[PDB]
Amino acid sequence: TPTLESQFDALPPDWRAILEPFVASDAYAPLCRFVDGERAAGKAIYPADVFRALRLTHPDDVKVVILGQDPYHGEDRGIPQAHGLAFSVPPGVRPPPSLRNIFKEISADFGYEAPRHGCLDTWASQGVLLLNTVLTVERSSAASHAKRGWEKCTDTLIHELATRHRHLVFMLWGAHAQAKRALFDPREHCVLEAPHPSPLSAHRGFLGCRHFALANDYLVKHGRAPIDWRLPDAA
Numbered sequence: 001t002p003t004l005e006s007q008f009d010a011l012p013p014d015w016r017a018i019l020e021p022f023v024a025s026d027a028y029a030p031l032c033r034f035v036d037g038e039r040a041a042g043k044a045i046y047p048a049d050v051f052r053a054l055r056l057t058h059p060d061d062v063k064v065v066i067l068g069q070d071p072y073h074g075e076d077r078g079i080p081q082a083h084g085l086a087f088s089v090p091p092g093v094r095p096p097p098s099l100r101n102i103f104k105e106i107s108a109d110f111g112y113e114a115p116r117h118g119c120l121d122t123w124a125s126q127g128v129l130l131l132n133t134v135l136t137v138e139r140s141s142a143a144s145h146a147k148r149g150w151e152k153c154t155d156t157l158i159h160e161l162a163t164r165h166r167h168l169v170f171m172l173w174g175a176h177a178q179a180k181r182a183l184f185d186p187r188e189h190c191v192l193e194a195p196h197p198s199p200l201s202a203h204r205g206f207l208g209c210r211h212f213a214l215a216n217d218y219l220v221k222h223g224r225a226p227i228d229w230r231l232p233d234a235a
């Protein structure tokens, strides 16, 4: 796996500019040494492609920001669930319960069928930034990995993105994601809040929130093409 610094350096210039306050901070080198040292010590740290969400969705192309907290720490048939996009799972992995509830809301909102798989790459290529606020995890451990270092980084990301690009849609699910409103001006953006889609909270108001339809209304209001919330038949 490339060192974390090399993964920061490989980002497009537009993302590097948004992350520069963090990369210039005292927290950057320690985060890099921690993640690199965990891998060097033989721990199963996921995903390998830490910034996949950013590589697939460049800043100018961001339309919708969907926050997760930690990457999945589980696996399915020996394939890790985390692959660098919030909520998404790679081809060959069954959708976990939170993602099934996301799909249930889309199916109810638009009448689409339940997808065959859980890979959200094709939403990222349409401008859906699928950003976990903590971007690494240790296999089978629910403990957040480098929580404080990563959140300094993704806090910088959210603030700088939102300050440079007006009229984004933010889907903020759960209290942790909703607290990220402190990082931007909510009158300049569409802020959609609901409980988290996990089964523990989904029936408190995630199911029924209509966020995917609301997001598309706001995009069209601002002259942008709406998201196709379907998924192609194969991943």
Ligand SMILES: [Cl-]
Pocket: 012, 013
């Ligand atoms: Cl370059």
Ligand SMILES: [Cl-]
Pocket: 017
């Ligand atoms: Cl700049």
Ligand SMILES: [Cl-]
Pocket: 025, 026, 027, 152
């Ligand atoms: Cl710092």
